[PDB]
Amino acid sequence: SFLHIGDIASLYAEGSTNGFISTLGLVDDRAVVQPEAGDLNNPPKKFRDALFKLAPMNRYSAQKQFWKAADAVLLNKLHHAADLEKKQNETENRKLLGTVIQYGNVIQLLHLKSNKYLTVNKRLPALLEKNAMRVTLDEAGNEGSWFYIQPFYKLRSIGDSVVIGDKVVLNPVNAGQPLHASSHQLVDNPGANEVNSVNANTSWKIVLFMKWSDNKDDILKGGDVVRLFHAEQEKFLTADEHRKKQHVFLRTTGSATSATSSKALWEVEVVQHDPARGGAGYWNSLFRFKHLATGHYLAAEVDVYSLVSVPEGNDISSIFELDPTTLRGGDSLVPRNSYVRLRHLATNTWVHSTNIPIDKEEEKPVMLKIGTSPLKEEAFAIVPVSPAEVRDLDFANDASKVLGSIAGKLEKGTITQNERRSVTKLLEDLVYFVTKPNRERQKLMREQNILKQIFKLLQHIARLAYRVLRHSQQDYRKNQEYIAKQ
């Protein structure tokens, strides 16, 4: 089993500091390792943040020129040169999908969640470790994104194919100090340890999530974020807190691809013997659905049985089989946008809609119970949600945490310098985010509590804050009516 350009994998630091490289979100650009967060047998709950796609060595020559030049006609020439170079990479790298990576090849590491390249900077010192260079996530990447993939043990050599599970050294082409998992811990995030660049003996185990072969856009696969649309009820399956506990329900309305809240998003896991695996869903596959907003798992438990939200995904009671509504003469793969019914594997029962509200005393109930039946004699659409759409949500959520944190420390008193810069850039990024502006992102401003946090912070940053608020309500009346009601 070999490593392929296009494979999605997690990298597991071994040695003195054991753990998977993950990140601290979408706003913060540091790479960390959380030793107590999860190991090979028991990967971290937030595992989607651990996945990297193996990519080829991008061309940065034309882009380096433009960045460096940041006449006027000169900019056009250089920008067109850079555009053509970014297109070259998309084209050439595509022809490299599914080729075997050989030891000594130069590779890049695209962090899936944030869509950024892990990148060393020769010219910048690590934030924490004494004599080490700095390692960040960069959207476009650059020459600092190039790693030689080298064998940690004499068991394999330069020129050899890289085997899945091999422990490798990831050595920058220019800084030339291997990637390193430090014993240095972050103060702001006690769980995490700094990943930096220095002469050390860190080894990284390539742990295959998904083969390039399975990462097709027209099939349902491990990691896919989906909405579950009950066909005849015309309602999305959502989870949310009511009366200080979590509930699974169908949301009343008054819609098959209508917009909804994040509380209706689900990440599909396809059960695998290996707990770090996922992969393409087949009809004869077993599935789990992790609620994206809370990390809770969909399940069925006695009340006969009703759909509920368990806090963890290691039990049998959270496993569902998918049952097709038609039959084809092709292969066993589940297509995207499939209409399915759900069979709860532990109880041999079928997911069923009801008319029993959860909010009893609450006039105008929007929470309908979903149960299961032993009897055979409906379907759900597995509505796919795009990675961009999920990133958007993750960014909004992280931006929400920062302003929350900083409003707390702002209420205590003085604001630190390396902290005041953090809060200001975010607002410039938020302006750039919310942009004739974008409707679906204006919603995220409100829904994910960016706006509520801006107002919190108010008690320069101020000018920038209002600029967000203004763009957040441009041609949007519901946001206008919200902003005023404070």
From Swiss-Prot:
Record domain MIR: where: 98-152, 159-209, 217-271, 278-325, 331-385
Post-translational modification as stated in the protein's UniProt record: Polyubiquitinated. Polyubiquitination targets ITPR1 for proteasomal degradation. Approximately 40% of the ITPR1-associated ubiquitin is monoubiquitin, and polyubiquitins are both 'Lys-48'- and 'Lys-63'-linked.
Residues binding 1D-myo-inositol 1,4,5-trisphosphate: R251, T253, G254, K443, R446, Y476, R477
Subcellular location: Endoplasmic reticulum membrane; Cytoplasmic vesicle, Secretory vesicle membrane; Cytoplasm, Perinuclear region
Lipid-linked residues (S-palmitoyl cysteine): A50
Subunit and partners: Homotetramer. Homodimer. Interacts with ERP44 in a pH-, redox state- and calcium-dependent manner which results in the inhibition the calcium channel activity. The strength of this interaction inversely correlates with calcium concentration. Part of cGMP kinase signaling complex at least composed of ACTA2/alpha-actin, CNN1/calponin H1, PLN/phospholamban, PRKG1 and ITPR1. Interacts with IRAG1. Interacts with CABP1 (via N-terminus). Interacts with TESPA1.
Function: Inositol 1,4,5-trisphosphate-gated calcium channel that, upon inositol 1,4,5-trisphosphate binding, mediates calcium release from the endoplasmic reticulum (ER). Undergoes conformational changes upon ligand binding, suggesting structural flexibility that allows the channel to switch from a closed state, capable of interacting with its ligands such as 1,4,5-trisphosphate and calcium, to an open state, capable of transferring calcium ions across the ER membrane. Cytoplasmic calcium released from the ER triggers apoptosis by the activation of CAMK2 complex.
Record comment regarding domains: The ITPR1 structure has a large solenoid CY assembly built around the central helical bundle made of the C-terminal domains from four ITPR1 subunits. The solenoid scaffold includes domains responsible for binding of ligands and regulatory proteins and is connected via an allosteric nexus at the cytosolic-membrane interface to the transmembrane channel assembly. Six transmembrane helices from each subunit form the central ion-conduction pore.
Family recorded in the similarity comment: Belongs to the InsP3 receptor family.
Name recorded for this polypeptide: Inositol 1,4,5-trisphosphate-gated calcium channel ITPR1
